[PDB]
Design a protein around this ligand. Structure first.
Ligand SMILES: NC(=[NH2+])NCCC[C@H](N)C(=O)O
Ligand SMILES: [Zn+2]
Ligand SMILES: [Zn+2]
Length: 622
């Protein structure tokens, strides 16, 4: 997509060349307004609103609106009108740059969900005595004025060497009025964007505040106001009229303010760079202010929490698969009770990136240690334990990464009287420690990177539960296979953790107390192909369905952003409660003690959820 400000440059060129000399009662003005609406119409319900003042005098202003859940919109006003006594002559410095940056911001916010709506307003006939802004405020009713979260104004975004962003003249009463001024100062400081403010040297104007722009009408209410202009308050009468210390001339007039003249005197690189800086700065300000960044961060946090729960369930399903391999081994050559029968080994797993489902493209890989041991008399029932370690570095998108060491303790008892029928049981306990590193990559459709922040966090989550399986089967030849039924239960608990990073996008999680009840039914296989003097392969595969009787995994979490702290409901999507998983592989025995394996587990659902996974490990039975 287009970089930061390139689209602003394109729309500036179109505005200044195709429709120069835009003023009230002009066909060029109508063409310019049509162009203005056409530029920012992406993702907006643009609707020009004609107004009148003093009878015959009338004009119109472009309004682009984005629906907001909170019902309080933020207004980005910037007129596209030139001086009245300047017909058919391009006005660049006056507000062409402002209009270009405004359309740039409107497009960069297009297609983005916003908790607070954005109402990009392109004013007109402003040079005629602020008619557009006053008429817009007049059209506002009590509800709109109550819901005016704030106002941002643009004007003369090129000529001024040092850019400024000063709040309204009403900042003297409420010290908190200049909230937008403070936010834009913070963003400019954090993005290496030089942005001063009003020095307040002149007593005629309030310190840190501007005047004589669109927000003169918005000052009527105690709402944040932000004038964004490029001037030079340390030069001339300290009122910004001499906006540039360069030779140049300086304001809107026929004799100056032309594309070629500005390019020759101030350099095209300067105008382009200032337009890019304004685009990026205001895009970040609108993101942080309309809480669109908070909405994106909460959406990414919901995705991260869902993926963390999926990682925990994947780890415990890997533990149960290890138990299943041990049971496969145990179902043959029962051997005398007692003696030495402990087992140990390392197991690894590679998860293909084809799982998808979760928004982060979950490419994962598992590895770790595990222990085993089991003996009991009568050779029918044998109960034993296991001590497992696992570190599944489930990797998100845009550099996101989740990883956690895990300790697992299980007690399982396998019962078989030597016949076709068998049954068993199982329990588990897991004390993992996630090191969350998620990414919040928010960008417009075809637009540049609006914001790319990486959060970090540390959480410990416990998990317990129970399990049991069994069945019976016949066999043709040396290989057996038949129906197996099982019950899986795990009451995961993910403790609340707050992100270490101090940003707006950092989140504050909550305790997750949810249970998964995977009732199952399927078919299994088990055989022995003893090719070689010591090798005895154990083919085995499964095709079993699962139907949850409960939530399975938490759907919606109450999250609060560190920037604001309000209660935000984040949706992690639906929970696939109707699917089935399949297994495949075999187990080798290099000797009586050593033995490798290669199991592939592949959850399959026809509607949504097709996770896949491979695994290879070696057991030293000693
Ligand atoms: N001292 C100032 N605030 N000067 C800037 C005035 C800009 C003027 N309202 C315009 O739109 O062209
Ligand atoms: Zn002007
Ligand atoms: Zn202006």
């Amino acid at each position: 997509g287009y970089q930061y400000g390139e689209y602003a440059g394109e729309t500036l060129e179109r505005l200044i060349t195709d429709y120069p000399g835009r003023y009230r009662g002009t066909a060029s003005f109508a063409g310019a307004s049509k162009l203005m609406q056409s530029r920012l119409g992406f993702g907006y319900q643009t609707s020009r609103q004609d107004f009148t003042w003093a009878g015959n005098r009338s004009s119109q202003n472009v309004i682009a609106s984005a629906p907001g859940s909170s019902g309080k919109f933020l207004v980005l006003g910037a007129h596209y009108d030139t001086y009245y006594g300047r017909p058919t002559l391009q006005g660049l410095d006056d507000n062409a740059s402002g209009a270009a940056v405004l359309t740039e911001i409107a497009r960069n916010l297009g297609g983005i969900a916003l908790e607070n709506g954005l109402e990009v307003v392109g004013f007109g006939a402003e040079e005629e005595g602020l008619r557009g802004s006053r008429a817009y405020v007049e059209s506002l009713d009590a509800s709109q004025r109550a819901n005016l979260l704030g106002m941002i104004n643009l004007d003369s975004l090129v000529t001024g060497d040092k850019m400024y962003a000063h709040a309204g003249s009403n900042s003297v009463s409420n010290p908190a009025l200049g909230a937008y001024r403070e936010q834009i100062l913070r963003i400019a400081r954090e993005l290496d964007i030089p942005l001063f403010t009003n020095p307040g040297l002149n007593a005629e104007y309030p310190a840190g505040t501007g005047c004589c722009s669109d927000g003169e009408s918005f000052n009527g209410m105690d709402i944040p106001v932000l004038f964004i202009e490029a001037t030079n308050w340390e030069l001339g009468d300290l009122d910004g009229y001499e906006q540039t210390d360069n030779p140049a001339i300086t304001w809107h007039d026929p004799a100056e303010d032309n594309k070629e003249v500005l390019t020759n005197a101030l350099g095209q690189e300067r105008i382009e760079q200032r337009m890019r800086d304004f685009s990026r700065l205001l895009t970040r300000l609108v993101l942080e202010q309309t809480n669109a960044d908070l909405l994106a961060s909460t959406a990414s946090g919901g995705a991260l929490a869902r993926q963390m729960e999926d990682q925990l369930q994947r780890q415990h399903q890997a533990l149960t698969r290890l138990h299943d391999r041990r049971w496969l081994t145990l179902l043959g050559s029962n051997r005398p009770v007692g003696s030495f029968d402990g087992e140990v080994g390392a197991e690894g797993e590679v998860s293909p990136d084809s799982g998808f489902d979760m928004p982060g493209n979950p490419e994962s890989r598992r590895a770790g240690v595990h222990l085993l041991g089991d003996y009991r008399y009568s050779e029918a029932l044998t109960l034993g334990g296991s001590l497992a370690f696992q570190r599944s570095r489930d990797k998100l998108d845009h550099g996101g990464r989740i990883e956690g060491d895990t300790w697992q303790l299980g007690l399982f008892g396998l019962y078989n009287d030597g016949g076709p029928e068998w049954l068993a049981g199982e329990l588990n306990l897991g004390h993992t420690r996630y090191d969350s590193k998620r990414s919040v990559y928010l960008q417009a459709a075809g637009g540049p990177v609006l914001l790319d922040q990486r959060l970090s966090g540390d959480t410990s989550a416990w998990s317990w539960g129970a399990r049991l399986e069994g069945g019976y089967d016949f066999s043709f030849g040396e290989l057996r296979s038949g129906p197996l039924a099982g019950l899986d239960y795990m009451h995961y608990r993910i403790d609340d953790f707050r992100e270490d990073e101090a940003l707006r996008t950092a989140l504050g999680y909550e305790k997750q107390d949810y249970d998964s009840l995977e009732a199952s039914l399927g078919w299994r296989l088990r055989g022995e192909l003893a090719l070689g003097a010591r090798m005895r392969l154990q083919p085995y595969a499964s095709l079993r369905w699962v139907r949850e009787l409960a939530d399975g995994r938490l759907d919606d979490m109450d999250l609060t952003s560190r920037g604001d702290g309000r209660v935000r409901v984040a949706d992690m999507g639906g929970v696939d409660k109707d699917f089935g998983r399949a297994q495949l592989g075999a187990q080798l025995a290099i000797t009586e003690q050593l033995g490798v394996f290669a199991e592939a587990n592949s959850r399959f659902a026809h509607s949504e959820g097709n996770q896949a996974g491979y695994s290879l490990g070696v057991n030293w039975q000693f």
